[PDB]
Amino acid sequence: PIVQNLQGQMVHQCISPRTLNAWVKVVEEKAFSPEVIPMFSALSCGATPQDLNTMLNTVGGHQAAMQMLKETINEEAAEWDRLHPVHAGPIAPGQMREPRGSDIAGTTSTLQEQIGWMTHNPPIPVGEIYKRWIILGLNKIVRMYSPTSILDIRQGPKEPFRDYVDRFYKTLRAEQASQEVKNAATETLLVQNANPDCKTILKALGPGATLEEMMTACQ
Amino acid sequence: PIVQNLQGQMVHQCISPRTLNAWVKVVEEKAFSPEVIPMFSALSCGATPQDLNTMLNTVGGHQAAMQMLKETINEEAAEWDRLHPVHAGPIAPGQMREPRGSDIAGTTSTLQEQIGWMTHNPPIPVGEIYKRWIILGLNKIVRMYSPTSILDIRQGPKEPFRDYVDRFYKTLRAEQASQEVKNAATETLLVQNANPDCKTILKALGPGATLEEMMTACQ
Amino acid sequence: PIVQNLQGQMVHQCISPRTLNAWVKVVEEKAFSPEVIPMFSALSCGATPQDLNTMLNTVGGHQAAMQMLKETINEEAAEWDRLHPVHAGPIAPGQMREPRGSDIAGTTSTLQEQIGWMTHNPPIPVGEIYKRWIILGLNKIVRMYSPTSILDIRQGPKEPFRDYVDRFYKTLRAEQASQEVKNAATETLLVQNANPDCKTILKALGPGATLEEMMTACQ
Amino acid sequence: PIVQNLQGQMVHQCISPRTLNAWVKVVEEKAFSPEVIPMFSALSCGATPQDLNTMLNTVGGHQAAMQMLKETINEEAAEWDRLHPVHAGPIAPGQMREPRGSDIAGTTSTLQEQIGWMTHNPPIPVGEIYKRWIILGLNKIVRMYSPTSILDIRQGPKEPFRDYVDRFYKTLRAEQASQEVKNAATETLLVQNANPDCKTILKALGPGATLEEMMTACQ
Amino acid sequence: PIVQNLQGQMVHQCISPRTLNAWVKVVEEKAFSPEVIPMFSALSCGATPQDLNTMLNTVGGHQAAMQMLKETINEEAAEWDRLHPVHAGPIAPGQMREPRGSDIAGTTSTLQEQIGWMTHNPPIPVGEIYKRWIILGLNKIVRMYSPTSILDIRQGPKEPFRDYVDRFYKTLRAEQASQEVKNAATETLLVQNANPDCKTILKALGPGATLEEMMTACQ
Amino acid sequence: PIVQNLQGQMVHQCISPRTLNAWVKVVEEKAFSPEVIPMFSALSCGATPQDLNTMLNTVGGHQAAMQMLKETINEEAAEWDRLHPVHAGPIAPGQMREPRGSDIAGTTSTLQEQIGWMTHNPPIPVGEIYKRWIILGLNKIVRMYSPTSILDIRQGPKEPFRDYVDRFYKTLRAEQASQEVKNAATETLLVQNANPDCKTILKALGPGATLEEMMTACQ
Numbered sequence A, B, C, D, E, F: 001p002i003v004q005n006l007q008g009q010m011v012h013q014c015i016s017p018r019t020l021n022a023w024v025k026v027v028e029e030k031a032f033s034p035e036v037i038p039m040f041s042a043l044s045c046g047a048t049p050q051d052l053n054t055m056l057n058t059v060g061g062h063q064a065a066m067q068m069l070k071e072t073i074n075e076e077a078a079e080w081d082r083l084h085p086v087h088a089g090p091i092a093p094g095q096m097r098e099p100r101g102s103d104i105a106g107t108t109s110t111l112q113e114q115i116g117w118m119t120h121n122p123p124i125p126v127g128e129i130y131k132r133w134i135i136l137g138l139n140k141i142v143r144m145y146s147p148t149s150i151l152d153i154r155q156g157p158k159e160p161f162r163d164y165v166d167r168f169y170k171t172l173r174a175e176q177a178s179q180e181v182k183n184a185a186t187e188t189l190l191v192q193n194a195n196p197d198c199k200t201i202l203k204a205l206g207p208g209a210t211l212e213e214m215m216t217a218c219q
């Protein structure tokens, strides 16, 4: 990654063993549960495109997902190149060349180049641009690997309301509902999908109940 | 987080793998036992609003609680905006804009903005303001998830007084009794809820007994 | 805690995940065995009153002990206030106010205030003052939770003398005998409580035997 | 490795216990699964040729692979010497000598020499040159140890398409197909090797289907 | 401990959690096997007398040994005071007082005092003086807890010579034979205590055989 | 060890808990498998003779090996003293004395002396000189503890060629064959010791086959 040291200049630092192992172990343990994504983002704080490729290449299984991700990256790299075409032919001696999509993705750029862009005044933030492409891809994978529709999350007859709500919102998160819809669903599908006893209690509460209110009501 | 480095200037540092894992593992192991909250506070020392969102987003289960928390945050953000309305329309070139509720919560502000506020002279402490909203929410969750009323903590016939007192005060903590009431309860409900043999001993001690005195008396 | 950095000025540093986990795990594993206290002291090296409260608040069980500790702290805070009364009414603009008992205990003081006191020339050592109150309380808890009188530690008929001595001194430590008495007991209660065969050997050694001499004698 | 310190000069630092253990444990756990290679590269960030030899020499099993690797290194070292012959006879007093293949590989050069080359202006990047030879060798080993042809990865009758695709691309990675072929295979061998039910669905999708599209189609 | 920081001045640093846990776990796992002593020495590198007491006080079992150690420390402290008597009555304002035995042992000196002595030009090395007393005591404990005389280590009839030699020298180390005697024993007691078949082989080798020679001979 | 700090001067640093534990655990887990030696070398990067003795003294078992090592060290120390005799009688006030064999080995030199030699301009590299003696000794131990002649490593009838080659080269490494012989053995003993089916295949390949070629041939 690129860090500020103890004296305020941005320098390259090697990716640490602890970060490398943390990422590999979260993918091993959680696969593409939605909470893997914020973990990836955090673990890649300050990353170069080299570092991001390191992290992705250290994954051993999930190769269908990693091929899907490559496809998304290639789509974004192609959109970059549409928006920001670069001069063909020789670079000015000693001067910084403009990055292409594949340079942002780390496949045609050197570490030195990357460092140069990321530490330019002002920075050409190749690591953040690439990390956004990656995360776009990873979100597609999360959606793909979500096993259950929201329509199929219904409260069992002896299921504590809290356990049902946990299932409900875990599902909505993997299915990638907007925050609008998660906020909204409390007045709709959450009640509809509740068991008869709790449905009756929630219906009587009236509209505008907070989730806390609904949860206390059906405790 | 924002740290002072080895030379006394406040700079951004990436959240460490160790902090990220510590938080995820405490939620995994303790759920919303009350002692999770001081742990969250400590682990988020120096945090930006970005960091706080990272920590909260890395939680994989407990999604009913995380939706409740979002609701509390939105209520506090709305109260902020009531108290501190911001100018609509264009910001002064190069100048710091005033934060809105959603900027404090990290959803509409960049990391750079956050850094700017937190390192301003004097600081606009967006990470501490947000952390207070979070903790308000988390305390509600703790209360929600407390399984037992204080009224139902009664000393068994062969239960060592110390084990009863441990249950009693663990309950009072999750139920969120004030320190007044925890201090006071030693003269009241603690005795009332003691088994007959210990109740007799405690009654004879007289008023004003310290907890230590009561515990020695019923050992 | 407050640390000297790499250039010799005292600055605040966040409590580390490793320190937070070390404390929680020692209480989990050892409860209030006497050796928990020096561990607490060491783990709280440099602590602010905020840090000390963090450590104590991260404990999840043992709430009878934690309520006893609060009581001891309140007694010491009251004695502080008797000895060092503070001016009522407004503080001099920009100037350091004098700490009250509850400010030393971290309940009515900010982190900034604490830092200010601890880094004043000369320091008002609020973290060390509070740590002493805490340790006074913790020593009471250790004594409370000591399960066995010294009078009941007697060497079994087939018990190796060394194993008996280990029990004996472990007990004396939890019971909180002075070093005088631990030094002295070798000529008295240690022999008295030895089995017949070893008692005979020790009696013949004469007075003034070192523990090493007694242990070799009964090997 | 060679690091920039906190003040921007490149200095030697000892290889850390954590890096040494991370490498040994990845070889122990993963052998020569393809994802070991990016791990080796990352763990050897900044390495001297001494460090690279340390890492390779700390491996205890897999000695057929380590002998193959020595052979590849010797081939590359011989090609170096063909391309960059060095002056025979005495070096200029106090001056940097030119590296031979065996000096790049760390067998005839001192650590000091290595440091000298790597920190020269401009650097003679002996650690990166050697790391490339190593990785050339390791890729041969990965191919050698790949247990299954791509021709033999066929979707079972009750095998979820996603699990088949994972096997398929894991195989292609160990077999060392180019990215061309991995990108291309989605229109060919992937469909051909799919079970009858999914083959029918994929055939109907038409050409140009993304992997995501194919995976959704056969879910 | 007292460390040089990144700029070459000697400053106090808190004892780390990792050092505190390492010591407690080595005593837990190895008790007073001889190799605990060099571990203690290494873990206490740079220690103040405060730190050494911390380490010793964090030990929970082995209280007969810890009382023996206190006795040895008191004997050395008394010998110090015989050799280096201090002025009674008031210290020169602002000036460093001379340490007494109990000040070296950390029982009557403050951390500040200790720091002062250890960082004086030239240092009064109170931590090294005390560490020597401690190690004198610990060596007595090792000898005490050694379970077997060297006379009783004899090679079994089917015991590999190497396993016998390992037992032999492990015993000699716990029994605290000088290096003279360990060097010498190869010509004497080692052969005498060997089984008949190996004894015959060793006798024929002649005098002056190295241990390596003896071990190869009886392989 | 001696390190360069963050500002480029060579200073002493305490051996870390992590390094101390890493060494003890590798000896515990691997004994004197050949790969322990490069691990020892790496873990002792920058070591003083004090540090090297610490590492060796922290080993609890294997005392026959540790006595053999002492013997080798004493032989090298005696050869040093033959080559580099030192002045008898008093040292020049304030000046650096010349090291004797036992000073290099850390038994008659102080840490301060060692530091002085290692940081002299130019250095008298006592830690590297001693580390070479140690490694000479450890290599003898590895050879001693190698359980099997190369002559006895023969491919079983159903043993995969790769598994045989792994055994073969693991053996050659413990037996301490030169790289000449390991390079050469591929044309000789490796084939001779192969099972009949693979022997026939290898014989037909002709001379000059690489190991990779031989391994592919017999897959």
Ligand SMILES: Nc1ncccc1OCc1ccccc1
Residues within 6 Å of the ligand: A053, A056, A057, A066, A067, A069, A070, A073, A074, A105, A107, D179
């Ligand atoms: N293993 C990887 N998986 C997903 C994306 C990228 C990875 O590494 C880099 C890459 C990107 C695009 C094409 C080829 C390689």
Ligand SMILES: Nc1ncccc1OCc1ccccc1
Residues within 6 Å of the ligand: A179, B053, B056, B057, B066, B067, B069, B070, B073, B074, B105, B107
């Ligand atoms: N997972 C989260 N859970 C609770 C609160 C906040 C979290 O992340 C940020 C957030 C806050 C409010 C609305 C949407 C997202």
Ligand SMILES: Nc1ncccc1OCc1ccccc1
Residues within 6 Å of the ligand: B179, C053, C056, C057, C066, C067, C069, C070, C073, C074, C105, C107
């Ligand atoms: N959990 C705590 N337990 C014991 C003492 C203090 C703790 O935190 C601070 C405190 C002290 C006194 C009253 C209230 C809170």
Ligand SMILES: Nc1ncccc1OCc1ccccc1
Residues within 6 Å of the ligand: D053, D056, D057, D066, D067, D069, D070, D073, D074, D105, D107, F179
């Ligand atoms: N164990 C090693 N294995 C593979 C390659 C290199 C290793 O160490 C260095 C080496 C290279 C070439 C010949 C001899 C030694």
Ligand SMILES: Nc1ncccc1OCc1ccccc1
Residues within 6 Å of the ligand: C179, E053, E056, E057, E066, E067, E069, E070, E073, E074, E105, E107
């Ligand atoms: N637990 C201790 N055990 C052995 C020696 C010292 C220890 O702490 C300090 C001490 C030394 C002497 C008397 C009293 C206390």
Ligand SMILES: Nc1ncccc1OCc1ccccc1
Residues within 6 Å of the ligand: E179, F053, F056, F057, F066, F067, F069, F070, F073, F074, F105, F107
């Ligand atoms: N345990 C040790 N084992 C092997 C060699 C050295 C060790 O420590 C130092 C030493 C060397 C020579 C004689 C005595 C002690």
